Structures are given as structure tokens and as C-alpha cells.
Write a protein that binds this ligand. Structure first.
Ligand SMILES: COc1cc(CNC(=O)CCCCCNc2c3c(nc4cc(Cl)ccc24)C[C@H]2C=C(C)C[C@@H]3C2)ccc1O
Ligand SMILES: COc1cc(CNC(=O)CCCCCNc2c3c(nc4cc(Cl)ccc24)C[C@H]2C=C(C)C[C@@H]3C2)ccc1O
Ligand SMILES: *[C@@H]1O[C@H](CO)[C@@H](O)[C@H](O)[C@H]1NC(C)=O
Ligand SMILES: *[C@@H]1O[C@H](CO)[C@@H](O)[C@H](O)[C@H]1NC(C)=O
Ligand SMILES: *[C@@H]1O[C@H](CO)[C@@H](O)[C@H](O)[C@H]1NC(C)=O
Ligand SMILES: [Cl-]
Ligand SMILES: [Cl-]
Lengths: 532, 532
């Protein structure tokens, strides 16, 4: 009854799940397209054909095929991001958490997982929607989408591997929500899409793309934006990386059809095993198969679209973490270790700069080095470590997002900007990594409300604050409740550029979120690289 | 007797002058070259032909022909630098102060005035040698040299106007000191040359030039160095400026001989009136007629001589003032005034950057602007004013000197570096100009010892503090007296790069003088300009 819902594609049967001291309804693993298997690998997706009978939606679905991290086997801090279900190309499913009793037409939030467009799962423990759905009385959806070559192999001109099909994956999920969430008590006119990392870039890409704009109301972007240097490639570079994938696998390279046909004959893991080999440079924070600027999903360049106001005009809430770079340095740069303070020698600093700005010429590398080096104290291993951390975070996350924020706000209908800088009391990663890429998510999804996870009382309060900000924004376009006695998160405006810190302390309002280095990253360095 | 001295060129009669509550001997206006007049204009100097009878050396000589500042008529702060004697091309004379009674063979210090190679006089009140000669028991010489076109018009390949003849004037005076100072109680083997601004650059040029090296023992450079961007031009640029001078005066331009013949017919003021017109850019801290890198006075480029160690190996003492740029902004840049705090708008800041780095392309100007702009507070008129002040001082004085210091110290036999940052209590210039280009000179020459000039007692001590450093360095190659236990001025070394502040407070040792900005000026910007 409460758990039996007839959708436009067929009947589904959910399950009743405990949440804190109560219960809510969960519909897990609902299919929203045809399995993209066999001759449909790399292809645009197709809607799921209606089914007879009742779809058992009591269990999480498979995860999409992806690279699996084995750097720290068994370590909870890294394994919490790996697939926790069987991987399969049959992975295009969504999950829904619905308050009990079912509401009539309440606000909908659709989570888009990140993972650099190469990884991610809707089923991770940290994305369990039940705490946010129960606490804030929202219908919480998490979608899925093909990652890696399966979602973003791009041979422009081919209709068999056109590129961006993972983005199209997200779109079909949003269209399914548009068509069916009313049967779960959700309001299809009040859908907020939100995501972190590539999910945040994705949210911004749907703001940009005409084919996506009418499928949601407003948007939240966490540590990601559509213009990030890692988040897209040209059609030429996408073509080069697809051909190099075939070269790594002894494919016929004479035509797209023969290349695609060879690649479609490979087992999924054969593609994954050579995925990182197609990158052009030794690099960190760079991923092989990402969205392409194609002229279809993206009509023109992202920058021209941002400049002209060619995007959805609505409210946005977005922000970054204090130490976005540390995860990438730990996994990919010399001198960093999970088990030490990772003081960085001058030599390893210079190596890290090269890995962090792989596209830069030697003059550009000199510019980055001078901007982030204290020449009164150039052998200070802690300053070198933190300087490289800032380089990676500023170049890859913060400065692209601030460029996006400033362009969007010229045309949009309300911007709210945050700086998340709380290090969790129970973090398993070392202190030099600070406030890590991905580690605001557990606060957004309410994990500190679970006493067994051993968060502090202040962290539970912070999680409750953030969930209420996110959900009140989703409901109203404004994270603040009116007539409330709590300090107000101010609008970000072109003139005053205000933002708040998010942490356990009373709110602080600041202005011009890191403005100096982003002048460097957004105006000076691109001009230097374009001149030289 | 004490005032009657037989030199190798003839007899001279000096005069007994009061100094504080005592007396010393002064020999003023001794000729060291033939008057460079008529056909001799622009020509290398020729030794003064010996005279019969007694040369009357009781009176200051004429000053060389030069541009005279009329910006602030009658204002003591600027008038103190103007010629205080009649100007004449018959101006190649030197002055000597000798302790009374005459010493046997004491240390000699030879002052070389500055003035951007376009101005300067040996006879200014602030260069009165009597306090230094009396207080420190040295023989103090001040020389003179042709400035402007008269000293530095350069038509390379012509022997009639070869360039660098003002430097050859200095050398001829040093040769005269070498040959004659023993008759005044000076030791020709212990001569220190010292100078400020262009005089400091000149001192460095004599260190470089093979034809000068044997005419002095060691060297002091104040707020100037041979590699300063204003201190030399190429033979091609000197030729362009000489031809343009002729163009301004309707000269025949078909040949060097015809051009020179024309310029020699003009009255001196006719040349001076158009002198600034030959500069290639709207600019500040750039001067028309300066030393040329000719392959004769300078055998190769300054940088290659410095890299190869092709220079005199001895001890040097040198330094800079806190606010070298302020004078040039007051006189040449928009928004500055003697009668206001000169808060600088953003627009006037950008204009000032362009005037300050006239040779830079737009990418270069962007780099300078980013390096000196606080983008959290870019409309702060005090920060804009002080940022421009630092740009002018760093680019033109401090960083070129630090480059020289660094290169010299690899091969030299002892470097002592200072940072003079005391603002005089009785300064007539406004507070925003800080510690001004030229305003350490009055301390070096002992003017705070004169009660009627109204320095504080701490400023008298500092002046005594500086005169003793300078004269002890001249005597021994080390500014510190041994077995004294005043705090010691450490050697500047390649590794530790120590320097001292010079001010009324107890001496503090620091390291790496303006190292951050000088990486920009000495390494990154030249690379950027070369590559773009
Ligand atoms: C040098 O060799 C390689 C090095 C690497 C480096 N990168 C990888 O292996 C991907 C590793 C995934 C790690 C798990 N995912 C994480 C994720 C996030 N944060 C993490 C923070 C820490 Cl401290 C650790 C892991 C995080 C946040 C999210 C964003 C991404 C890109 C992946 C996932 C979600 C890949 C391939 C190589 O061959
Ligand atoms: C009007 O625009 C122009 C502006 C100028 C610059 N004009 C000048 O006369 C330069 C200023 C003359 C006074 C120079 N004397 C000074 C000198 C020094 N310091 C000074 C500090 C202050 Cl605050 C004021 C004057 C100083 C230190 C020394 C260095 C120089 C170059 C000149 C002389 C000695 C020239 C031509 C122009 O057309
Ligand atoms: C030297 O010149 C001074 C000043 O003109 C004069 O007072 C003095 O008598 C002269 N000495 C002579 C002519 O012996
Ligand atoms: C200067 O040279 C002497 C003798 O050649 C040497 O003993 C001394 O160490 C040198 N000093 C410096 C500072 O180079
Ligand atoms: C110096 O001080 C004396 C006495 O205090 C005063 O008469 C004189 O005007 C002062 N000089 C200047 C130049 O201000
Ligand atoms: Cl100041
Ligand atoms: Cl050394």
C-alpha cells in the first residue's frame, strides 16, 4: 500500500527501513533505462521498457563498472568510496527514500554522485538517503550513470559512441523523476539536483545544457563546477583518447565503426585495466573519460555560454572544502604518506607542481612556483606541503568554482556560497590532509546523527544545520528560514561577494573567497599560457 | 705651507676652513682635465696641462651644464640638489678636504655624485667633505664629471663622440688622485670610491672596467648599481638617441661628423632644453644620456662580465633606502603631490605601473600589477600608493643591486650590505615619501653633527655610526672595529645573505633583502619578457 507504487513503467514494491527511532519507505534499485550492454555499450541510453508484475525494490542495485582503488586494502577511509555491490554494465537504476506517512507533494532532492567521472556508486553508506529524508521531510532520490569509457568514450561524429552518454544517463533519471516522482509523494516542480566532485560539475552541466534545464528547479554544487579543468575535454582530445584506448587493446583503428566494434567485444575489466594509460601527461586530478564539448549537449564553449547568460536562471547553493587537494597528492605525488606528516622537500615540491599543472609550459610552471613559494623560507617542508595542497585545490576546485559563481551570479536569481572547513573528530586520515575532498558529504547526509559513528555533539548539530540549509534551499530557494532568530546566510552578490564558513563555530561572513590566487588562476595564468 | 702643495701639474693654494669647533684644510676647484669646450665637446677628456704659478684653490668650481629643476621654486628640499655655482662646460675640477695637521699617508675616500647621469654637482652643501674628513681622519676628495649629452652622447665608431666620456672624466680624476694625493697626505694604495644613485652605478662600472680597476682599492655603492635598468643603453640605442637629439635641433643627419659638427655649434642650454625628448617611452626613472655598453669601457655585456667574474676582486659595502621610488613618482606619475598624502586611485595605479616599467608588454604589466595588488582591498589608496612606491624602488634600485650583490659575492673578497630605513626628524618632504632616494647622503657626510641643522641627538649618533662604518671600511675592508664590542655588521655571504638595518635603533641582522620581490624582478619577469 504505502510501499506499493504504480509508476508509468510498471509497479514497484519498496521496503520499510528503520531510521533513528522511526521508519521511512525505501524504493531501491528501480530501473530507469535499458541495460546499456552489448551493442548498446557507449550508446545513448534508451528508456526502460515497461515491465509487468511488481519490481522488487527492496535491495540496492549493481554498481557501474569502474576502476577499484586498492592502494590501502581494507582501510575504511578509502574503501568507503569503492563499489559495495557487484559491478555490472547493467547498472542504470535509482533509489528513492520517502517519508512515512507518504507526503502529498513535497520537495525532491536528487543526488548525483561524484568520482571524477571515472568512479562512483549510488549505494555507498555515506550516500544513504534515509537520514536526510526523515529529518527534513524530503523525497530523496539517488541516481546512477555510466562512468569511465562506458559513459564518456567520445568519437564525435559517431552516433554509436557520441560522448556524454553518462550525462545523458543522468538526464533520463531526471526525466524519470519528472514523470514519476508524483506517485511517491514528490513534487516534480520542486526538484533540486545536488552532487559533489563530478556530481557537482554534472549539476552545473545540466544548468548549462538546454536539454536538461526544464527537468529540475534549482541546484546545489559541492566541490565541483562545470568549468573545472578536469571536468571536460575537446572533441579532438576525446577522439585522441578513444583511439589510444583502442591502440592499448590491439584494436583496428582504421574507422570509428571498427574501433567501436573492437571495444564492444572487450570484457569491461579489459577497458578499465588500460583506462589511465590514455592520459596525455603524468598528472594528478586528471581523468581519462570525461564530458566532451560537443555542440549538442553543450551548444558552444562553456565560457561563451557563461558569458552570454546561456544557461538556466534559478537559485544555486554551492561551495568548497578547505583542503581539496590533499587526497590527490596522497595518491599521486612524491613525498606524501598516509602515515607521516608528509613534509615536502623543495625537489618534491617542484615535482608536485609539474604533476598538478600538467598542461603548463616552463614559464607557467615558474609562475605557479613563485606564487606559492615563500622565498624567505623555501626549505620549510610544512610550507611546501601546504603550498602544494593549496595549488591542487585552488587550480582544480576553488578557482574554477569561483569563476563559475561570479559568471552565474550576473544572470541568476540567487547565489549562496559556503566554505566548509571542519575537520571531523573521528577522521581516519592524517591531520596534514585537513578538510578533505568528499568529507563534507557525511555531514550533508546526516551521518553524525548516528550515535554509533562517534561524532561529537557539536558535529551532530553541524550536520543538522547543514541538512536544514540544504533542504530549506531545496524547498524555497533560500537556505534561511524567515522570521527565524538564527544568523542568516547572506546572498552572494556581484558587488559584495559574501560567503559563510560552515563549521561548529558561530557563523562568520567573509568576502571574496580566496580572491588573490584565483586572479592568478582565472586571469593571469591563462593569459600567460595563451601568450606562450 | 700646510695650504701650499706642489702637485705634478703645478702648485695649489688651499684654504683653512672651520669645522665644528676646529679647523681643516680645503683645496677647492683643482683642475684635473683640459676644459672640454668647443671642439672638445663630446670628446674623451685630456689631462690638464701643467700651469706655472699658484692655482687658487680657495673657492668651489663651476658646475657642469645640466637640466635644473624648477618644479618647486625656492623649496629647500629640491633646491638642495640644484647647481649652487654657475654652470659651465669648463667644469672638470675636484675638491679635497685634508685633516689638520696633514697626516702622513691616510685613507682616501673619493665621492662620485649621482643624479641619473643627467645632473649633479660636487659642490652641494650635502656633499661638504669637511665633517667626514675631520671626524674620521681621512682625505676626502669629491670629483666631477660631464652629465647629459655632454658626458654621454654616444655615436659608437666615432672618436669625436664615442660615448662614456663622463665615465672617462671620473677615471681621469681617479688617475689624478693616484698620481697626486700623496702630496696631500693621502695613501694612493688605500683609495675607496663611493657614490650614490648614478655615482653608485659609476662605482660599480669602475669595478667592472679593466681601465679603472687599478685606480682604487675598494668601493661603496649607495642606492645604485651598474646593472640598473636606467644606468646603461646599447650602442644602437645610444646612437638612436643621439640622432634624435640632432633631429630635435634641425641638424644635418647624413653622417656622424656632420651631426657632431652641428651639435657642437649649439649653446649648452639648447641641448638641455630638448634632452628629455629623445627617451623612447613615457617613463619615470629613465634618463636620456647614460653609459653605453661599447666593447671598450665595458669589454662585454654587464651580465657576462658578472657571470664570468671579469671584474675587480676586492671588498664592497653597499645598500639601499626603504623608499627609493617616492621621489620619481612625485615628479612624474599621476596622483602624487608634495602637499597631500597622495592616496592613489586604481586608475592612477595602473598608469603608474606603465610609466614604471615602460619596456614591458601587457602580459608583463599584468604580472607586475598582480604581484603588487591586494585583491582583497584593491581600492585602498594607501596600499595603491605604497605598492607603486615599492614597484619603482624594487625595479630600479633594490633588486638590480641585489642581483649585483649576489653575483659579486661569488668572486669578491668581502661584501657588507645595509638597508637604510630612518626617516629624518627634520625632513621637509611629506610622510608618504618615507626614506627617500638620496636622503642617506646627509648622514654619510655628517650633517647631523651640525647643531643648527636640528637633527636629534639619536640622529647625530647614527651619523657618527655611519661615518665610522664607511671610513673604517675604507681603511680596512671591514666596517667593524676589532676588539670593540659594539654589535658586529656581518659579512654578506652567498648562503646566509645577511644584512643590517641602519637606523636609530640598535642594530638588527636580517637575511635575504626583499627576496620575494627580487625573484620576480630578477628571474621571473625577465624570463616572461624574453619569452613573450
Ligand atoms: C599513481 O597510480 C594511480 C593513482 C590513482 C589515483 N586515484 C585513484 O586511484 C582513484 C582513487 C579513489 C580513492 C577513493 N575515492 C575518494 C573519493 C573522494 N575522496 C577521497 C578522499 C580520500 Cl582521502 C581518499 C579517497 C577518496 C571524493 C570523490 C571524488 C573522487 C574523485 C573519488 C571519491 C569520490 C589512480 C590510478 C593510478 O594508476
Ligand atoms: C616634468 O616632467 C619631468 C620631470 C623630470 C624630472 N625632473 C627633475 O628635475 C628630477 C628632479 C630634480 C631634483 C632631483 N634631485 C633629487 C635628487 C635625488 N633625490 C631627490 C629627492 C627628492 Cl624628494 C627631490 C629631488 C631629488 C637623489 C639623486 C638622484 C637624482 C636622480 C637627482 C638628485 C640626486 C624631468 C623632466 C621632466 O620633463
Ligand atoms: C683666491 O681667490 C679668493 C676668492 O676669489 C680671494 O679672496 C683670494 O684673495 C685669492 N688669492 C690670491 C689671489 O692669492
Ligand atoms: C679574502 O682573501 C683572503 C686572502 O686571499 C682570505 O684569507 C679571506 O678569507 C678572503 N675573505 C673573503 C670574505 O673572501
Ligand atoms: C633650527 O632650530 C633653531 C633653534 O631651535 C631655529 O631657530 C631654526 O629656525 C631651525 N632651523 C630650521 C631650518 O628650521
Ligand atoms: Cl611610507
Ligand atoms: Cl660567500
Amino acid at each position: 500500500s504505502e510501499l506499493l507504487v504504480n509508476t508509468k513503467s510498471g509497479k514497484v514494491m519498496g521496503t520499510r527501513v528503520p531510521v533513528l527511532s522511526s521508519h521511512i519507505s525505501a524504493f531501491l534499485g528501480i530501473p530507469f533505462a535499458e541495460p546499456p550492454v552489448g551493442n548498446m555499450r557507449f550508446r545513448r541510453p534508451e528508456p526502460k521498457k515497461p515491465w509487468s508484475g511488481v519490481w522488487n525494490a527492496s535491495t540496492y542495485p549493481n554498481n557501474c563498472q569502474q576502476y577499484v582503488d586498492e592502494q590501502f586494502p581494507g582501510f575504511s577511509g578509502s574503501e568507503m568510496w569503492n563499489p559495495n555491490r557487484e559491478m555490472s554494465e547493467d547498472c542504470l537504476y535509482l533509489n528513492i527514500w520517502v517519508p512515512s506517512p507518504r507526503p502529498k507533494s513535497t520537495t525532491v532532492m536528487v543526488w548525483i554522485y561524484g568520482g571524477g567521472f571515472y568512479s562512483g556508486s549510488s549505494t555507498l553508506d555515506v550516500y544513504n538517503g534515509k537520514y536526510l529524508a526523515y529529518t527534513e521531510e524530503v523525497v530523496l532520490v539517488s541516481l546512477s550513470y555510466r562512468v569511465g569509457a562506458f559513459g564518456f568514450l567520445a568519437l564525435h561524429g559517431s552516433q554509436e559512441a557520441p560522448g556524454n552518454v553518462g550525462l545523458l544517463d543522468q538526464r533520463m533519471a531526471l526525466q524519470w523523476v519528472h514523470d514519476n516522482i508524483q506517485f511517491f509523494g514528490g513534487d516534480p516542480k520542486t526538484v533540486t539536483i545536488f552532487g559533489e566532485s563530478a556530481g557537482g560539475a554534472s549539476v552545473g552541466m545540466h544548468i548549462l545544457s538546454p536539454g536538461s534545464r526544464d527537468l529540475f528547479r534549482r541546484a546545489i554544487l559541492q566541490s565541483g563546477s562545470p568549468n573545472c579543468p578536469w571536468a571536460s575535454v575537446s572533441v579532438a582530445e576525446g577522439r585522441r583518447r578513444a583511439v589510444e584506448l583502442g591502440r592499448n587493446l590491439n584494436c583496428n583503428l582504421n574507422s570509428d565503426e571498427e574501433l567501436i566494434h573492437c571495444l564492444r567485444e572487450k570484457k569491461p575489466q579489459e577497458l578499465i585495466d588500460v583506462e589511465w594509460n590514455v592520459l596525455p601527461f603524468d598528472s594528478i586530478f586528471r581523468f581519462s573519460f570525461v564530458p566532451v564539448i560537443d555542440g549538442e549537449f553543450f551548444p558552444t564553449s562553456l565560457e561563451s555560454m557563461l558569458n552570454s547568460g546561456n544557461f538556466k536562471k534559478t537559485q544555486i547553493l554551492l561551495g568548497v572544502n578547505k583542503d581539496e587537494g590533499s587526497f590527490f597528492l596522497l595518491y599521486g605525488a612524491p613525498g606524501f604518506s598516509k602515515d607521516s606528516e608528509s613534509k615536502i622537500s623543495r625537489e618534491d615540491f617542484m615535482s608536485g607542481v609539474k604533476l598538478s599543472v600538467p598542461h603548463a609550459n616552463d614559464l607557467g610552471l615558474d609562475a605557479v612556483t613563485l606564487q606559492y613559494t615563500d622565498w624567505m623560507d623555501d626549505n620549510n617542508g610544512i610550507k611546501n606541503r601546504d603550498g602544494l595542497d593549496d595549488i591542487v585545490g585552488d587550480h582544480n576546485v576553488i578557482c574554477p568554482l569561483m569563476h563559475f559563481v561570479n559568471k552565474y551570479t550576473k544572470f541568476g536569481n540567487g547565489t549562496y556560497l559556503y566554505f566548509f572547513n571542519h575537520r571531523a573528530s573521528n577522521l581516519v586520515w592524517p591531520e596534514w590532509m585537513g578538510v578533505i575532498h568528499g568529507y563534507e558529504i557525511e555531514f550533508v547526509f546526516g551521518l553524525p546523527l548516528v550515535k554509533e559513528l562517534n561524532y561529537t555533539a557539536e558535529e551532530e548539530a553541524l550536520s543538522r544545520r547543514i541538512m536544514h540549509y540544504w533542504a530549506t534551499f531545496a524547498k524555497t530557494g533560500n537556505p534561511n528560514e524567515p522570521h527565524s532568530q538564527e544568523s542568516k546566510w547572506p546572498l552572494f552578490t556581484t558587488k559584495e561577494q559574501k560567503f559563510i564558513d560552515l563549521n561548529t563555530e558561530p557563523m562568520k561572513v567573509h568576502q571574496r573567497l580566496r580572491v588573490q590566487m584565483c586572479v592568478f588562476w582565472n586571469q593571469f595564468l591563462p593569459k600567460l599560457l595563451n601568450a606562450t
